[PDB]
Symmetry: C5
Subunit: 338 residues, 5 copies
Amino acid sequence: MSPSDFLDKLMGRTSGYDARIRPNFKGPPVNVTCNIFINSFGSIAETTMDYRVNIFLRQKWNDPRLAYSEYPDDSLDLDPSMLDSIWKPDLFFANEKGANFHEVTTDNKLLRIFKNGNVLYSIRLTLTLSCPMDLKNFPMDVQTCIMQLESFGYTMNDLIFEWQDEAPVQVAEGLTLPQFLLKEEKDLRYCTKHYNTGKFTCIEVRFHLERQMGYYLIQMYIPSLLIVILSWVSFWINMDAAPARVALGITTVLTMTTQSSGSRASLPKVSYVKAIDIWMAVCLLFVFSALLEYAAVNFVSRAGTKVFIDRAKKIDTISRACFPLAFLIFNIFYWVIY
Amino acid sequence: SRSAPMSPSDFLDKLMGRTSGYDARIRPNFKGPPVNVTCNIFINSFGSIAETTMDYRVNIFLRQKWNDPRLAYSEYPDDSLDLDPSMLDSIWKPDLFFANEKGANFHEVTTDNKLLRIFKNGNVLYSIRLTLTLSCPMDLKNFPMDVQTCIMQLESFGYTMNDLIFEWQDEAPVQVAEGLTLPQFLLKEEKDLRYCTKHYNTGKFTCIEVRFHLERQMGYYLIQMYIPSLLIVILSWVSFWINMDAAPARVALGITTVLTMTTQSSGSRASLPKVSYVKAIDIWMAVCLLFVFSALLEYAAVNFVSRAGTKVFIDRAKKIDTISRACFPLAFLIFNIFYWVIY
Amino acid sequence: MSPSDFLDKLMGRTSGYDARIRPNFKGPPVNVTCNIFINSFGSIAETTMDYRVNIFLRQKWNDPRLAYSEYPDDSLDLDPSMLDSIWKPDLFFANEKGANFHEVTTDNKLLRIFKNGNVLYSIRLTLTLSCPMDLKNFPMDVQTCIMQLESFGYTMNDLIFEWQDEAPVQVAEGLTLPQFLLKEEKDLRYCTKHYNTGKFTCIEVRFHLERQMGYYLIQMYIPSLLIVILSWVSFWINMDAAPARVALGITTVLTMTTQSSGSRASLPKVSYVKAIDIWMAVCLLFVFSALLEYAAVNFVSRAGTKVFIDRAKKIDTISRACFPLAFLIFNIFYWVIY
Amino acid sequence: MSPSDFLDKLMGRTSGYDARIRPNFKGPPVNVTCNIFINSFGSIAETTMDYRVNIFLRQKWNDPRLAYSEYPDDSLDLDPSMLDSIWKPDLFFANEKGANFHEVTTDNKLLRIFKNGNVLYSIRLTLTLSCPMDLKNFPMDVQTCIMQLESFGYTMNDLIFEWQDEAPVQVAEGLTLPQFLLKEEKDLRYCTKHYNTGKFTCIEVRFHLERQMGYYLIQMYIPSLLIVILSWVSFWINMDAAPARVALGITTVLTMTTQSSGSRASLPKVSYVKAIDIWMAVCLLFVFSALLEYAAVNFVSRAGTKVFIDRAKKIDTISRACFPLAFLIFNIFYWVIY
Amino acid sequence: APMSPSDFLDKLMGRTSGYDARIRPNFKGPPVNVTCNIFINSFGSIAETTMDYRVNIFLRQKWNDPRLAYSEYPDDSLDLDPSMLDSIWKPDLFFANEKGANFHEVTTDNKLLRIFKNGNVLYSIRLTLTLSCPMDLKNFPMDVQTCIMQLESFGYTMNDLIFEWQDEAPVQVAEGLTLPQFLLKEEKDLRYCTKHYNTGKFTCIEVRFHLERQMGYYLIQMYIPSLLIVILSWVSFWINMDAAPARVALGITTVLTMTTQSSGSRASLPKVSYVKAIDIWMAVCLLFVFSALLEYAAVNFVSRAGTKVFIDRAKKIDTISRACFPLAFLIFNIFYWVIYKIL
Ligand SMILES: C[C@H]1[C@H]2C(=O)N(C)c3ccncc3[C@H]2CN1S(=O)(=O)c1ccc2c(c1)OCO2
Ligand SMILES: C[C@H]1[C@H]2C(=O)N(C)c3ccncc3[C@H]2CN1S(=O)(=O)c1ccc2c(c1)OCO2
Ligand SMILES: C[C@H]1[C@H]2C(=O)N(C)c3ccncc3[C@H]2CN1S(=O)(=O)c1ccc2c(c1)OCO2
Ligand SMILES: C[C@H]1[C@H]2C(=O)N(C)c3ccncc3[C@H]2CN1S(=O)(=O)c1ccc2c(c1)OCO2
Ligand SMILES: C[C@H]1[C@H]2C(=O)N(C)c3ccncc3[C@H]2CN1S(=O)(=O)c1ccc2c(c1)OCO2
Ligand SMILES: *[C@@H]1O[C@H](CO)[C@@H](O)[C@H](O)[C@H]1NC(C)=O
Ligand SMILES: [Zn+2]
Ligand SMILES: [Zn+2]
Ligand SMILES: [Zn+2]
Ligand SMILES: [Zn+2]
Ligand SMILES: [Zn+2]
C-alpha cells in the first residue's frame, strides 16, 4: 500500500479519524508516559527567581485507532505535519513563565507510530520556569528547582501522566553550569492539582542545585578578610599620629559598608538575614571596634603624663593579640556552622 | 430496544458545526436581555512588581461562565461534556479584555492552554491561561513602610451594558495558589471586588474590578538602608571623644561621614521612579544628614572658640564636646521615637 | 430578516460588496473623522527620545454600501470578524517607533454601522511614538510630544482625515505621570505630507508635557547647595591646619565633579549646554574658589610674622561674608531667569 | 469595466497570471529602480556597532502582464491585498541585523500600476543595520554607515537593482540626531556579490555621520582640565604641609584614573588606542608628575638646613611656571593634530 | 514549443504531479545524503556572561530527489520561486546548540530554491542563530575560545537521513568581517557529532570556530592602570617618615583603589568559581601595594622613641624598599608574562 493512501486511511480524509476524541474515549483514562532530555540548563536568576531550560519532551501513549497491519515494520517514522491530524495530550508546564517551540529550519518535532497503535511524540521546547529560592544560607545555599507537567483540560478520569520507569530525565553529556552543580539525583513526584474546575493530572521533577563557593571567596570573603587585616595595622602605628590611625579606621569602615551593600547587589530584596549578611555584619564590628579602640587610646592619653601614655599603650599590646585571635575564633564558628 | 448513542463527531456537527446552523456572530438571547458572564480567576503566580515602571505581572486562569441556549443538549446523560478547545472558535464567547493591561499573552505550549466545558442546559465554562502585565499606580509617600493597592479590570470592548454584563462569582471569585510568596511584599488575604462600569463616547460598557492589597516588607530596608545609616550617624559621634588639637582627624571624620550620607541618600531612591514629592525614606536620610552635618559644625565651633591657647577658651571649647557627647545620641533617640511611632 | 442572512446580503457572499473599493469610489474623497481616548500615557524617555501610549482609536466614515433598512434600529453593533469583510481606512502613525494591537482575550475591536451607512470603528492600540526633545532648560523644561495620523496608500483625492469637532482627544480620569504634568490644552493641526509618491492626508495632535521640578531639588539642587555650604566651613577653621582645610577643599571639588557628571547620567549625550550644566559649573567654581582661597591664605602667611598672619586673616573674614553673599546673588539671577 | 472584474482579468482567477514567473521571463533581467525615504534615523550604538532606521522602500519595475487599456487613468492605486497576487522582487538588506514590517492599523504598503505595466511598490520598514566603526579618533571621529539592497534568489541575468537617478535617498525635513550630524552627501555604489550559489545584484548607500564634539567638552575634556589645574595648586602650598600636598596629589591621580576608565564605559572593548585615551594618559602624567614633584621637594628638604629648604624652594617656583606652560604646549599639539 | 512554467510545476510537484512531500527521496532505499555548507554573513555578540554568540548565515543544503528530475528544458538547472519549497520534501535540519534562531522575511522570505536536470536540489536559507559556546576563562584575558555549531536531524534516523559537509569550501566567511574583541582564526575544524538518544541514532555534523581574544583593551583598561597604582605605592618610600598621615593615606588609598580595581575586572564576566589569570595579577598587585603600607607600619613602629639608633634603623628599611619592591615587581612580571605568552 502506498504511503499516501495509507495515511489517508489511518488519519486522513477516508479514515474517519477525529482528533477531537481521545483514545478509549468511553473507557478509562489515557496513560501518557513522559520523559525529558535536557539539552541545556542555565540562566538561573536569583533576582527574577527562575531558570531556563532547553529540552526534548517525549510523550508516549496508545491510540488503538492508529494501529496498523499493512507493513511488517515494528514502527513508522511519520512526517510531523501529521501531528495536526491526530489526537494528542494537552501537556503544559504549570510553573512556566515563558516557553517556545523551535521552527528552524523546520518544526523540531518527531512522530513515530507502532503496529499496536502506540505513539511516540518528541518536541523540542525552551522553557523558563519559576524556581522560588530560599537564600538563608547564601552563598553556601542549595536550591531545589522544579518542573511540573500538567493537563489543562483533561480531568484525571480522561487523562493521566506518569514518568518513565527507566531513565525519565536524561541530561546531555558534559553539561555544566558556571555557578552551580547539578546533582545527579532528581526527585520525581505527583503534583496532582485540584481546582474549582476539577482534579487534573500533574507530575513533577525536582532538580537540586548546589551553589559553587569559589567565586564568593575571590569576590566577597577574601577581599573582606583583607579589610579586617588592614584595620589591625592601626595598632602597630604610633598613638600620636591621630589623622593616620583615624583615616585608617574610617576608610576601612566605609569600604566595609559598600562591601556589605555590594554583596546583595545581584539578589532580590528579600527581607530576611542571609549568611553573607552575618559575615559582613561581624566584619563590620571587627573593623568598627578597631576605630573605637583608638577612640579609647586617644581619650585616656589626653594629658601627656607617663601613667596614662603607658595605660593607653597597654590597650594596643592587648588589641594586637586579641582581635586576630577573636576573629580566628569567629571563623572557626562561622565556617563549621555552614 | 436500547440503541447506540450518537457519535461525538456527529453530535458536534449538529450542535455548533456544519449542519448546526449555529452562528457565533450572534450572542445568546440576542433579541433579549444581556448575557450574564460570571467571572472568577485563579492566580497561578504574582510578581514582577516594579516601582519604576509602576506595574506588576500575573499568571492566571481566567474562568468565564455564561448560558447559551443553543448549546443545550439531550443526547447524552452526562451533566456536562469536556470539549476539545478547537471548538471554542465555533462558538460565541464574551470579548473580555483587561482595561489596565500594559501587555498580555496566551499560552500555546504544548497546546493552547484552554478549557471548554458545556452543560446539558447550555451553560458554558471557559477557562484560559493568561499572563498579564497590569498597571498599578503607586503612592510612595510612606516608602518603604508603604502599602499599595494594585487593581485588575475585566471589561467588554464591544458589547454595551444592554447586550453583555460581567459579574464576579459569589463563592470564591479570586483564588490564589497555595504557598505563593512575594519576596518584597505580603499579599493580603482580603481582595476588594467592585464595579468599574465605563462610560465612553462609544457607550456604556460593563467592567468589574478586583483590588489586591500589597504591604511592603520592612526587613530589607533595615539591612540595606536604616542600619547602615545609624552606623554612619554613630560614627560621626566618635569625633567628640577625639582630642580637639587633632584637626585633620576630626575634620576628615566629619567630612567622610557627610559624603557617605549623601551617596547613601541618593542611593536610596535609585530603584524608584523620579516622583517629585517627599518620601518617608527622604525624611530619614535628611534628618540623618543634619545629625552628621551638625557634628562637623560642632567642631567648627570647637576649633574657632579655641583659637588662642588660653585656659579660659580651651575649657570653653571643652564644654561643648562634653555636652555634645550626651546631647546628640539623646536628640537622635528622641527623633527615632517620633519617626517610627509616626509610621 | 435573520442576522445571518442580513450580513450575507450586506457584505457577505450574496452581497457583491468588494472591500478593495473605497466608498464613493469614482466620486470625492472619503472623509474619515478621528478621535482618540487615551487609556494610558507614560514611558517618557529622554535617552531614546520617545514615549508610550495606550489608546482607543475611533474612526468614523460613510459607506453607502452598508446602509440598511431591514431593522428599525438606528445602529447595529456587529461582531468584529466582519471588519475583514468591509473597506476601511489605512491609517498609520507616521511617528510610531513601535505599535501593536490587543488580542486578549479577543481582538479589542469595535464595529458599529448605522442606517445611513455610517461606520464607527474603534480599535485599541499601544503605540511608542518619537518625541524629539529640547533639553536647553532641563530640568525646568517643557516638551511637546506629537502624534501623526496618516494614510499610507490613499492620496488626498481619495481619502482625507479630520479631527472630531467635539472632544477629539479624551484622557482617562485620574491619569497621572510621575515626572510630568500633562497640560489640558492639546493642539490639533494638519501635517499633510508631500512625498515623491504623492500628497497624503495627515492630522496631528500635540501634547504639552511640563516637567515637575520637585525630584531635582531632592536629588540634584539641594545636595549641591549642601556641598557648597560645606566648602564654606573651611573659613571658620584655623589657618595652621593645612591638611584639614585642603582635604575639605579637595573632597568638596571631587564630590562636585561626580555630582556634575551624575546629573547627565539619565539623558542623551546632547552637545549643548543645559540649565543643570550651568548650575553644576557655577557650583564647581564656588567650591573650587574656596580651595584657591586657602592657597592664597597659605601662601601669603609663609613667614610667621604678625603682618602676614593678619593679612591672611583678613582674607577669611572677607570670604566668610563674600561667598555666601555672592552665591545668594547668583541664585537670585539663576532662578529668576528660569 | 467594474473594478472587481478588471482585477480578476489582470491578476485574479480568470487572468492566468502566475506570480511565480518574473516579467520578461525568457528575456533579459528585470530592472528594479530603488529609492528610499528616511522617516527616522537613530539608535546609533558604538557598543553593538549598528544603527536603526525607519524607511519607505520604493521599488519600481515593469511587468508587461499588468499593462491596461480599460481606463484612461495614467495609473491606478490598488489595494495592497493585491500585492500577494503579483510577482515582485525579493529585495533584502544584506547587512540587516533585524527588520520588521508595519501592520498598524493596516499593512503599511502601497501598490500603484501604470497603463504600460510599470509598478510602484512602497513598503514601510524598520531596519537595524550593522555599521562597523573605526574609533581611532573618538570622540572627534566620523563614521560611514552603509545599507545594502540585494536579491536573495535572483542571479544577475534575471534581476538587477539600480538607484533612481533623481533623488534616490530622501530624508524627512528637520530630522536630527543628538550625537551626530548626518551629512547631506550620500555615496551610492554597487556591492555586487559573488557566492558559491552565483552572482547576485546588490546596490549600496553610504551615510556619513560626523560626531558632535560638544558633549565631550562638557563631560570629559573640561572636567579633566579642572583636575589638572587642581594638581597645580599644590605648588602654592607650603612644603611643610606633607599630608595636604600628598592628599591633593593622590586624590587628583585617583580621580584621573576613574575619569580615564569612565571615558571608555559606553564603547566596545576595542584593542587599540583612541584619541580620548591619549588625552587621559597625558592628563594622567601631568597629575602624576605633580605628586612626584613633591616627592622630590620632600626628599631634598630632609635636613632643615637653609641650603636645602631653598633648593627645594627652587623646584616649586619653576614648577608653577613649567607645568601650565608644558600643558599649554601639549594642547597646541593635540587639538591641532585632530 | 516548450511547456509553460505553470504547467511544468503542476506536473513536477503540484496538483497533477502526485508528488508527496511527506515521503523522502529513495524512501524504501538508502539514506538521503544532504551536503551542507554555510556562508557567514556576520559573526558577533560574543558574550562571556551568557556564554553564547550570534551569527548570521546562509545555510546551503544539497540533496537528490529523483522525483524532481526534468527533461522538458535544456537548462542545467532551474531557479524556482521559493513558494515551491512548501510543495517539496526537504531535510529537517536544526541547530543542536541553538539558544535562539529566526528566519528572515523582509522584504520577502530570504530563501533560494534551485533544481537540476537530474533532480538535485540546492536550498539556501538565511538564518540568524544564537549559539551556546561554553567558555574556559582560566587564562582570561589571554584566553582562546572554541565556539561550535551543530547541524542535526530532529526526526530522521541515520538509516533515512545523513548529513555531511562539502568537500570544497564548506564554511565561507564574508570578506573584511572583523570582531572587535577577538580574531577569528582561518582554520575551522569539521567533525561528526552523531547523537544517540533513547529515540534513536541521529545524524549530526559540527564546525568549530577558534576565537583568540585580543589583549590590547586589557592593557589600556586593566594592566596599565594597575601598574600605575603599584608605582604610586612606591612614592611613599621617598616621603619623610615623620609624615604619618601622608604615608598612611597614600598607603590606604592605593589599597582601596586596588580592591575596586580587582572587583571591577570581573564585572563583565560570569561568576565562575575558579581563579583566572587576571585574578592572579590583581592579587599579586594587591600584595605589592598592601606590603607598602605594612612597610610603613614597620618604619613607624621601630622609630617610636626618637633615639638616633632607631631613626637610622627605620631609615635602613626605606632605602632597601626603594630598590627591593620595583625589583621584586619586575621579577614578577618576567614570570607572569612569560608563563602566559610562552604558553
Ligand atoms: C468525545 C470527547 C468529548 C466530546 O466532544 N463529546 C461530544 C462527548 C460526548 C459524550 N461524552 C463525552 C464527550 C467529550 C469527552 N470526549 S473525550 O474524552 O475524548 C475528550 C476530548 C477532548 C477533551 C476532553 C475530553 O477534555 C479536554 O478536551
Ligand atoms: C446579531 C448581532 C448584530 C448583527 O450582526 N445584526 C445583523 C443585528 C441585526 C439586528 N439587530 C441587532 C444586530 C446586532 C446585535 N446582535 S448581537 O447582540 O448578537 C451582537 C453581536 C456581536 C457584537 C455585539 C452584539 O456587540 C459587540 O459585538
Ligand atoms: C477601485 C479602486 C482601485 C482599484 O483597485 N481599481 C482596479 C481601479 C479601477 C479603476 N479605477 C480606479 C481603480 C482604483 C481606485 N479605486 S479606489 O479609489 O476605491 C482605491 C482602492 C484602494 C486604494 C486606493 C484607492 O488607494 C490605495 O488603496
Ligand atoms: C519560470 C521561472 C522559473 C520556473 O519556475 N520554471 C518552471 C522555469 C522553466 C524554464 N526555464 C526557467 C524557469 C525558471 C526561471 N523563471 S523566472 O526567471 O521567472 C524566475 C522566477 C523565480 C525565481 C527565479 C527566476 O530565480 C529566483 O526565483
Ligand atoms: C513514507 C515515510 C513514512 C510514512 O508516512 N509511511 C506511511 C510509511 C509507510 C511505510 N514505511 C515507512 C513509512 C514512513 C517512512 N517514510 S520516509 O522514510 O519517507 C520518512 C518521511 C518523513 C519522516 C521520516 C521518514 O522520519 C521522520 O520524518
Ligand atoms: C500507566 O502505565 C504504567 C506502565 O506503562 C503502569 O505501571 C501504570 O499502572 C499505568 N497507570 C494507569 C492509571 O493505567
Ligand atoms: Zn534529593
Ligand atoms: Zn481591603
Ligand atoms: Zn498650545
Ligand atoms: Zn563620501
Ligand atoms: Zn583548529
